[PDB]
Nucleic acid binder design. Structure first.
Length: 394
RNA sequence: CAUGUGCCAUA
């Protein structure tokens, strides 16, 4: 901090002015200093004359090098967002130029700023506050190669992609959907702790749910077409996704969402069916199996139940009943059946009552749990299944 | 086995 501004105690002189700092050529020293930056933030929220604004704009968002330096600064990035805000609230002559130049600064460094812990905040703030059409030009600056993968899986940049999805029209980021649907890209991105959230955020935005009812018919169709292209890639590789430590969260989201019923059903048929015993024994896939049971249409559910009770290859029911992960599936099956039988769960579909089927499945589980109660009583899951059945009796 | 998975990030 420049000596001219300081005390005999080395503290910023009370009554130091914003104009003083602006006139001194030393704004950059204050802006990267914890204390100076706090001063500057208070100063710029005040009432600024035309000239103070002129200098603020030119010094904070008008010089490329200093702009990037501040945007990638731990304290400075805050001044930059505040100054961008002021600049958008100021409809003076140079309103457009400034905003155009800001777009250009950012665009020329999109990747690095996206990946930067501090500059990614400048990016998110600009996407949200800039006029739509300038914001859309920022989006076009995103890389379309391996760097876009690195962005979607980055701890900082993933929030940029999520912000794009939240505030930018689909027409302008449609490329991202197809980039992600590229089979190899989908794999790398869904199997990542950040990537899997980004993909879910994209799916949610592409879902014809209650948050999309304001869309026009053109917009709904654009949304639907993209949804279909993404889902095609998702369902083609759902086996791989369903068993991954991260991607299983995506498969569960789809399976559990009524607004995506058709994809739920495709996924159940394409990768779960005929694999229930195997998948119910996996750490990650077991949770997807539980979802399937909870949300499957009754027709498929019946095939799922039959697969367990009379499936191929110390029977399947026994394996799952006592397995460390499988017991959570059997419990789910049981709860489903008890709920149905006590009317807590709907048993009718397509104009017909599937109650006798539930009745059959319950019967089977009761008879098995009755015969195995000595072993089941050794386990927490077993105790619970026994008790579920006892409070049914009531 | 009284049992089994994630991310939601800046002064």
């Amino acid at each position: 901090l420049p000596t001219w501004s300081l005390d005999s105690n080395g503290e910023m002189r009370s009554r130091l002015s914003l104009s003083e700092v602006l006139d001194s050529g030393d704004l950059m020293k204050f802006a990267v200093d914890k204390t100076g930056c706090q001063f500057l933030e208070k100063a710029v929220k005040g009432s600024l004359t035309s000239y103070q604004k002129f200098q603020l704009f030119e010094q904070v968002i008008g010089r490329k090098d200093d702009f990037l330096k501040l945007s990638t600064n731990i304290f400075g990035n805050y001044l930059v967002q505040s100054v961008i805000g002021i600049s958008l609230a100021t409809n003076d002559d140079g309103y457009t130029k400034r905003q155009e130049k800001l777009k250009n600064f950012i665009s020329s460094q999109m990747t690095d700023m996206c990946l930067d812990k501090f500059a990614c905040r400048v990016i998110q703030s600009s996407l949200q506050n800039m006029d739509l059409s300038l914001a859309c030009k920022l989006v076009q600056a995103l890389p379309r190669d391996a760097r876009l993968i690195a962005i979607c899986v980055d701890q900082n940049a993933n929030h940029v992609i999520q912000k794009v999805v939240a505030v930018i029209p689909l027409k302008n980021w449609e490329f991202i959907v197809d980039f992600v649907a590229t089979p190899e890209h989908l794999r790398q991105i869904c199997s990542d702790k950040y990537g899997c959230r980004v993909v879910q955020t994209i799916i949610e935005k592409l879902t014809a749910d209650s948050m999309n009812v304001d869309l026009t018919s053109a917009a709904q169709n654009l949304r639907e077409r993209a949804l279909q292209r993404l889902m095609t890639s998702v369902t083609n590789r759902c086996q791989e996704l369903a068993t991954n430590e991260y991607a299983n969260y995506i498969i569960q989201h789809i399976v559990s969402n009524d607004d995506l019923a058709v994809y739920r059903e495709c996924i159940i048929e394409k990768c779960l069916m005929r694999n229930l015993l195997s998948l119910s024994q996996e750490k990650f896939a077991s949770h997807v199996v539980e979802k399937a049971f909870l949300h499957a249409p009754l027709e498929l559910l019946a095939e799922m139940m039959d697969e367990i009770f009379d499936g191929y290859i110390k029977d399947a029911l026994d394996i799952m009943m006592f397995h460390q992960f499988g017991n959570y599936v059997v419990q789910c099956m049981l709860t489903i059946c008890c709920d149905a039988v006590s009317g807590r769960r709907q048993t009718k579909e397509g104009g017909y009552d599937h109650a006798i089927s539930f009745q059959d499945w319950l019967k089977k589980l009761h008879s098995r749990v009755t015969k195995e109660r000595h072993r089941l009583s050794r386990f927490s899951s077993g105790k619970k299944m026994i008790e579920t059945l006892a409070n049914l009796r009531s």
